[PDB]
Amino acid sequence: DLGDVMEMVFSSQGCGSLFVPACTAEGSYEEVQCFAGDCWCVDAQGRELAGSRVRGGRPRCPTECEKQRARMQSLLGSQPAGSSLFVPACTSKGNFLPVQCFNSECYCVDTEGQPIPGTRSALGEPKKCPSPCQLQAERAFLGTVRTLVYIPQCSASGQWSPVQCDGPPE
Amino acid sequence: RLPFQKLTGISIRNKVPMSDKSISSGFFECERLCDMDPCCTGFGFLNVSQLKGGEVTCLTLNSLGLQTCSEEYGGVWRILDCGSPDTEVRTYPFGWYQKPVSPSDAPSFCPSVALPALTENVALDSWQSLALSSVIVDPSIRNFDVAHISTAAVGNFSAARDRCLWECSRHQDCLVTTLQTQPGAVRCMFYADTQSCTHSLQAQNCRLLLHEEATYIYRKPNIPLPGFGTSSPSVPIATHGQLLGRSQAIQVGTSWKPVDQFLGVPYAAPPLGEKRFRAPEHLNWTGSWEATKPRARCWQPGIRTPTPPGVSEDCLYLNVFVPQNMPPNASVLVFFHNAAEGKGSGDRPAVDGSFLAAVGNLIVVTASYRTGIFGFLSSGSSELSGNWGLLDQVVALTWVQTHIQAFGGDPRRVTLAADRGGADIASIHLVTTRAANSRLFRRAVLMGGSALSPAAVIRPERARQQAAALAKEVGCPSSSVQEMVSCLRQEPARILNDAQTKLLAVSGPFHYWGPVVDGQYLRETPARVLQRAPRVKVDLLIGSSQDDGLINRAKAVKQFEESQGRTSSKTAFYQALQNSLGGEAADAGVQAAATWYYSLEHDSDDXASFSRALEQATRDYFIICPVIDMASHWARTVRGNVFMYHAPESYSHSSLELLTDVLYAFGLPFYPAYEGQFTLEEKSLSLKIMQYFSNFIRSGNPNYPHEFSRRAPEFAAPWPDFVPRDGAESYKELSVLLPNRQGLKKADCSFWSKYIQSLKAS
Amino acid sequence: AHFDLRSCWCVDEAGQKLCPGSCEEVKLRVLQFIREAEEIVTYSNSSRFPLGESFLAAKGIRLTDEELAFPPLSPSRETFLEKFLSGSDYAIRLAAQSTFDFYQRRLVTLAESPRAPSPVWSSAYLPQCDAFGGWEPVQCHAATGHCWCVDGKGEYVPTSLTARSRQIPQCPTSCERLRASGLLSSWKQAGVQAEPSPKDLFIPTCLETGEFARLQASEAGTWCVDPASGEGVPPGQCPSLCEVLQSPGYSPACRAEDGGFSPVQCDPAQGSCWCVLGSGEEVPGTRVAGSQPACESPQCPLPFSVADVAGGAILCERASGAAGQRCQLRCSQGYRSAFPPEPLLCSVQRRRWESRPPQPRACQRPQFWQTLQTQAQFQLLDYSGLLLAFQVFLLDELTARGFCQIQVKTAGTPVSIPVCDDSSVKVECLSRERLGVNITWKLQLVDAPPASLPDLQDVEEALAGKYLAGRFADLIQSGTFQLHLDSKTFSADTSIRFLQGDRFGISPRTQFGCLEGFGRVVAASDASQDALGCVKCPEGSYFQDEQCIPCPAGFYQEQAGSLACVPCPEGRTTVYAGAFSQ
Amino acid sequence: IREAEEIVTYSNSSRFPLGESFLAAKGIRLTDEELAFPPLSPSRETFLEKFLSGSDYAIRLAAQSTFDFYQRRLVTLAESPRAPSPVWSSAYLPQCDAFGGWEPVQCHAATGHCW
Amino acid sequence: LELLLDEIYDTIFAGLDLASTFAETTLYRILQRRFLAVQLVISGRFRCPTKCEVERFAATSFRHPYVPSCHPDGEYQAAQCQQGGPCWCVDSRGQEIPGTRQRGEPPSCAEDQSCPSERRRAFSRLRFGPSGYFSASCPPSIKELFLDSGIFQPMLQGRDTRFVAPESLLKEAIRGLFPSRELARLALQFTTNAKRLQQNLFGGRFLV
Ligand SMILES: *[C@@H]1O[C@H](CO)[C@@H](O[C@@H]2O[C@H](CO)[C@@H](O[C@@H]3O[C@H](CO)[C@@H](O)[C@H](O)[C@@H]3O)[C@H](O)[C@H]2NC(C)=O)[C@H](O)[C@H]1NC(C)=O
Ligand SMILES: *[C@@H]1O[C@H](CO[C@@H]2O[C@@H](C)[C@@H](O)[C@@H](O)[C@@H]2O)[C@@H](O[C@@H]2O[C@H](CO)[C@@H](O)[C@H](O)[C@H]2NC(C)=O)[C@H](O)[C@H]1NC(C)=O
Ligand SMILES: *[C@@H]1O[C@H](CO)[C@@H](O[C@@H]2O[C@H](CO)[C@@H](O)[C@H](O)[C@H]2NC(C)=O)[C@H](O)[C@H]1NC(C)=O
Ligand SMILES: *[C@@H]1O[C@H](CO)[C@@H](O)[C@H](O)[C@H]1NC(C)=O
Ligand SMILES: *[C@@H]1O[C@H](CO)[C@@H](O)[C@H](O)[C@H]1NC(C)=O
Ligand SMILES: *[C@@H]1O[C@H](CO)[C@@H](O)[C@H](O)[C@H]1NC(C)=O
Ligand SMILES: *[C@@H]1O[C@H](CO)[C@@H](O)[C@H](O)[C@H]1NC(C)=O
């Protein structure tokens, strides 16, 4: 029926030899697909993303920060001139930067890019953020607690301790 | 309830009036009356005597006979019995009802009933039986009709087959009959033309399209028209006599098709002497006209000084190309073209329509017409109105309307086509009220020209100035129009053509002749006419070539100028730049804006670079952007379906004067005269493009060969509609991959159509 | 002069130095591909190459023989490396093909535990050619069940592709294709081939068998053509196909009456002497590899006023001496006898068939295997009662828990393949309180979606894997299968066994079969050898029990693939068995 | 080096087909279930992961194991042409001090390069 | 709904002959479309409730342990659940799919799963061999006719509004306005310009 035609055209937006897709044990697309020396990232429906393809290598697929950054930057292109909308900053490996700022207000954020309470300050006032070992440690005290319902060890100063131990926390 | 509204050869068991009851009660009784009769196979509950108001009636039947006139079928094409106005069987719950189909027959005591025998026999040998491999099932087929025959109303299948083959033989538009056995009946399906061919470089394989599978398929062979059948066809022309043509074998791939050719058919009296600069007149010819050789071609600017044998003022002839054994009422292409020959021989036309006619399964007409001064000399007034060559095209189109049936074409399926200059000239027919009131054509193919061109029409005062300049050049007086016409009518054609070539040079006066608003054929300029609401729908296929341009179009004039001893001096550069973008086309501001935009250097001496920049500037202004403007206007105002192409730049065949779009659309890679000059990829590309253009001529859509079938094209990618909105504006690129692209020349055409058209509006 | 004093070879149309017909030339490339893929397996068992060298070739780096200082060997590194330096689709198919074959052999040799080897007729597609190197109009791929039509030069014919249909499609020969197109559209053939006039154009005339007729005509005149191809102009009152060939390895000896191939052909060198058809193709089962192969025609006439056997012919021995003239029905290539093999005996002297008369309509078209079947056995834990009630009750319980459907994890909507019927469950009483239950899942291949289960191997594993049989073995081994029957409970034992061809094993094996109206012609055991195992029961026949049995005397059947024989009217009968009309 | 010598080890006792590394270089790997291949101690996965990532590491690994396979063979079958390479001409090995730190001078014997 | 007939207009879209049944008249079609527009304003959907939504409403009213869960377009969700009970997967009719009864987690109801079928098709294409005709992608002609032409894109997005239509609203609207291809073909026969279409379909400017 004509409703089916509307669904088929809607599905066909963004549509396209000896390529063999790689699947997971659960039957979902493996998020990295490779053919003839190229490799790219795919979504749930197994469609290639625009900038994923890398020759002679294996790409790192987009993270949370990188996807938010690419989403907030497609809406800063609708704001008026001389106007600021927040845009998160991401490291080269996809992680969030420790400090995020917006209209001269700055926060420490965790690995999910959420403000850490008690860390706000003004732009230009240096702020001491918790170390990356302290954050992944905390973030894993509740990885454990959730499952009952190793967590990371931090040498003095918050620098990762060269020896790391497994098991329940102590 | 049967879907069929008309039953033929029924057998009635009882008739019961039901007018003293509710419609619900009468239906309930009619059902139980057929229940009580062991021989009843169904009943009718209907109004009889509907012309006197109708009477509710129950008719019990022991045979339903031949069931026709289904409401589901016969929508576009009906051939069987329909429309009985004294009976009402449509409104719920009226209808013919069947007892449920069971393989257990009626009691043995029931009367034997059979359809009445046919009055005359059916040969079976005048019918071609087709295998299932020769057909394609296409559920989008719509031009078909259905009948059902009760399985108890015919003794055996042979009786059912002869009844259904007899129905088709009575209707001349029925070409195919199929029979299929259902549990309760024999289903007969009748088709019009549904042929579908696969074209390749090896062999041309053609099949029939059917709505559904069937077991037996019978086709009626095509019978040639009265004068056809041999290799010397002789077509009767009403009020004239016989027209004698030739027959030619045409090769595409490894297949051969015979095409009948009628070359040099007059459509008007030769415009000589007092008929020069006059409206075309009827030619009274009788007896047999020999139409086996191409005739002379019209005078054009730049004809070589040793006059070729095929140049004459006697040039109002058309050529007809008719493939053999077509289905009735073929579509017709009328292509207007004057050849700038020097390669075409005296036995072969320069544009052979045989290959497009054979591949497209249609009739091609190529016609010549007066151009230049001979076709458009005007004083800007009723004394010498002008438009003589436009009236030639009207007369030639009227001839097709009068005479094409005799060759086998439908006068209602005509497409008008022209290329380069003629496309600008032939687009005037789209804005004249007479051409629409006559219905001279249904579709248009404009190849490199538009009615929105800046040079489409000449202003009346420029025509008076240009007429005087030609009078001055040949020695005639300009004091009076009647005096000047008389002296120009005694001149030799060679003398008049040398004068017009001299005055036509762009580095000189740029005196080009074209249509003028006269107040008879052309009542107002094309821009005003297109602002009005459309009256009739015309499908438009339009495009352009990157190899087109004013200098390319005037290379013969340039060659003449050099032979006369006139080179590119500095004032030649000056006139070339002013004349190109000016002459009602620019004030001092438009010239400066275009100079900036195209980096045109007025005071250079490099004719090469200056010509390249100017040709890029004038191609957009005069050719490409007017084409896009016309396609946008035609789509925005719903004047018809719009399809646009663009032929990208070529370097391969500069010796041929035809551009890329005409060479592919007419199949020149298949011409025997050019064997060894085209690659197999150009042949394959040309064959695909001929299928696009044939489809548009036949159905008004380059994707479909039939109006009543919507099966997706397989020879190439589909060609999208032209939608006049930013982000859309798709076109077909005529390259090897035939891709679809969006927004041709968007930046350059914005400059001309928005910025420049606003500089000229102030 | 055409003198021979130099080396010769065969060449393409454009001078490629590679005589074979079109189909046979394409066929030789696929045979080369298989041989190379098996060479890769050969070199992979006797270690002559490092494992990472093909990876290096795929990256464009090859180590030359001088810098390795490697003395050349007979299987030179160059032979293997060239296959992989060109990173073409040919090399990818070659690497894939040799990769399965290496592992499937190993798995089998080390321990053939998990499952059965693939049928040897599921392989790369091999073009099917006629007796003279041309393309057969029907092309089929057994591994997928796909069949399609090709034209005279092997090009696919549009929208002719079919998948797993009961009947293999009919494809016109080149003559019939050219004639039908010529009649519809007047796209004709040229008689003179250089500057033809419209009177030199002709529509080919075809024999009813699909061959070009010897004499083709236009208005310019008539001429002779090769029956197997209209090319024609045979300049040797038209030469017969043999006579065209006479001036196939050895040149055939042919009969003087018309030029038809003599019934006995021979190889002058090899000792094989055999029989041929009227066409000249060999009868499949007649190579005698000795003098006087039995090529004689019978003296006894055919049973029901029929002119000749359709597919094959009745080839007898020499006139016997007492009057037996022992004969046998041999079907042509591309045909199988629907009914089992029979010896026929003729009375030269009565002049009537002493044995059962031969069946004129026996030879039919074989079809692919149509069904797949697996069988398991479990036990339900009184007698001398009607157990056929329990057959319905068990089927209902199997249906309720979804063991009579296959669910295929497609993209959107999932198709359900029914794998049961009323004959699926058979129960036998073994001992008190323990019933014996047989469950048989039969999949019809016409229902298996070709888009979700492309190969017949994919169909086998869907029927004998985690969605049907592996999921049912776990349910039985657990102990949670009980049947509710008037408050009484019948729990099933934990033991389950699978049929494996007369040896109940612990793993399910599939078995190929035919549909309802189709008789088996290939034994069950060698179904791995031959893919065409099903023939439709002909017009003189009915179907019972996997065999096609001829209508007995007094009965007639007119439509093929029927389940019974219509009796003659009470006043009439049939003189012989296998009557096929009213 | 240990992985490159494992490749040579698996290349003498034939546990893998010759064209499977080529297949991995093209992105196609055959999963263990569809091969119906019962897992072995040198699992196909250990070898295949090295070659599915078409990185420079795999190219060096395939090259290094390719010379070592042929140089052993040439020697064992017939050590006719020339001498085996000095065993101190190999991949560059970082030179460390007694406490795991870098020695300020680093040298590569196979090329005579120091930095 | 009580629909008043006093102020409804007349329309151009119509057949040549008067319909056989009342269900085939323009009178029924106008009443049906007005009903659907009111449904859109009072329920969010240009349609009537689906089978899933009716059963979900009845389960919530009588407080049944198993409440069916529905997508916003009316379809059954693949994963169904009972209150503190087992979970399972269902088909489009809402009937449990055999062999999918999980206990704790919302089941791995196979939604997309185009990979294993795609992977099988690629292997059968590899195994076909070197030469011969073979056994996310665009359906034929759809991209060229609908998306290359730029026909579909103005339909999807709002004009002078930031409102973006869901796919369900577009599928519901086309089903509600044109129940069949033959009725849509009738509308094209008698609609010259698209500014008149709503007035013909609804017997007035109803949507405003
Ligand atoms: C089938 O035939 C029956 C009987 O002839 C038709 O019923 C008749 O229909 C007419 C007009 O529809 C009725 O006539 C009168 O019309 C005037 C209008 O001027 C009205 O004021 C009266 O009240 C009355 O309706 C007539 O009464 C009626 N007869 C019966 C017995 O119902 C019927 O219309 C026909 N059906 C079809 C589909 O043509
Ligand atoms: C409020 O509605 C009335 C009624 O309009 C009719 O019913 C609507 C549901 C819709 O289908 C309209 O197209 C119908 O015409 C409007 O009154 C009508 O206004 C038009 C144009 O102004 C006029 O031609 C009619 O004669 C009016 N009919 C009546 C009965 O008054 C009214 O304009 C609407 N109010 C607003 C603010 O739009
Ligand atoms: C259940 O299945 C088994 C296996 O097919 C059947 O046992 C076969 O029975 C036939 C006929 O009696 C014998 O010819 C075979 O030799 C038997 N095979 C084996 C392995 O025993 C058994 O008859 C079936 N039971 C029922 C009730 O159908
Ligand atoms: C079919 O019926 C007709 C009816 O007269 C008659 O020719 C004969 O009985 C039948 N013919 C054939 C050919 O079956
Ligand atoms: C052609 O069309 C006309 C009108 O549509 C029709 O009357 C005629 O029968 C058709 N066929 C021929 C051969 O004229
Ligand atoms: C490898 O070759 C040996 C003989 O050298 C043979 O015994 C063995 O079966 C072969 N293995 C295969 C072919 O897998
Ligand atoms: C391969 O292994 C065998 C023992 O299995 C050994 O004798 C031989 O030298 C080896 N070849 C090499 C390492 O090249």
Author numbering:
A (entry chain B): 594 to 609, 614 to 746, 759 to 779
B (entry chain A): 1969 to 2730
C (entry chain A): 892 to 909, 922 to 1139, 1145 to 1155, 1164 to 1237, 1241 to 1300, 1310 to 1510
D (entry chain B): 937 to 1051
E (entry chain B): 250 to 384, 406 to 478
What did the paper state?
Thyroglobulin (Tg) is a 660 kDa (2 × 330 kDa) homodimeric protein which is the most highly expressed protein in the thyroid gland. The protein is secreted by thyrocytes into the thyroid follicle lumen where, upon iodination by thyroid peroxidase, Tg functions as a scaffold protein for thyroid hormonogenesis and as a storage protein for both thyroid hormones and iodide. An oxidative coupling reaction in which a diiodotyrosine (DIT) acceptor receives (via a covalent quinol-ether linkage) the iodophenolic ring of a neighboring DIT donor results in the formation of thyroxine at an acceptor site and dehydroalanine at the corresponding donor site. Tg is a homodimeric protein packed with multiple Tg type 1 (Tg1) repeating structural motifs.
Here, a three-dimensional cryoEM reconstruction of bovine thyroglobulin at an overall resolution of 2.6 Å is presented. In this report, we present a high-resolution structure of purified Tg (iodinated in vivo with normal iodide content) from the bovine thyroid gland. We have been able to definitively identify three (of 70) tyrosine side chains per Tg monomer that are modified either to diiodotyrosine or thyroxine (Tyr24 and Tyr2575, indicative of acceptor sites). In addition, we observe four tyrosines with no discernible side chain despite well defined main-chain density, which we have tentatively assigned as dehydroalanines (Tyr89, Tyr149, Tyr1395 and Tyr2542); these are the only identifiable candidates as donors in thyroid hormone formation. Nevertheless, two acceptor–donor pairs were clearly identified in the structure, involving Tyr24 (acceptor)–Tyr149 (donor) and Tyr2542 (donor)–Tyr2575 (acceptor). Our high-resolution cryoEM map and model provide clear structural evidence for Tyr24–Tyr149 and Tyr2575–Tyr2542 functioning as acceptor–donor pairs. Both thyroxine acceptor sites at Tyr24 and Tyr2575 exhibited extra densities in the cryoEM map, revealing two phenolic rings coupled together, forming T4 at the site of the acceptor tyrosine. In contrast, Tyr149 exhibited no side-chain density in the cryoEM map, likely indicating the conversion of Tyr149 to dehydro­alanine. The distance between the Tyr24–Tyr149 acceptor–donor pair is 27.4 Å (Cα–Cα) in our structure in which thyroxine has already been formed. The second iodotyrosyl coupling site, where the donor Tyr2542 and the acceptor Tyr2575 are located, depicts a similar mechanism in reverse. When compared with the non-iodinated human Tg cryoEM structure, the α-helix with Tyr2542 has been slightly unwound and rotated, resulting in a 7 Å shift from its relative position in non-iodinated Tg, effectively creating the binding pocket for T4 at Tyr2575.
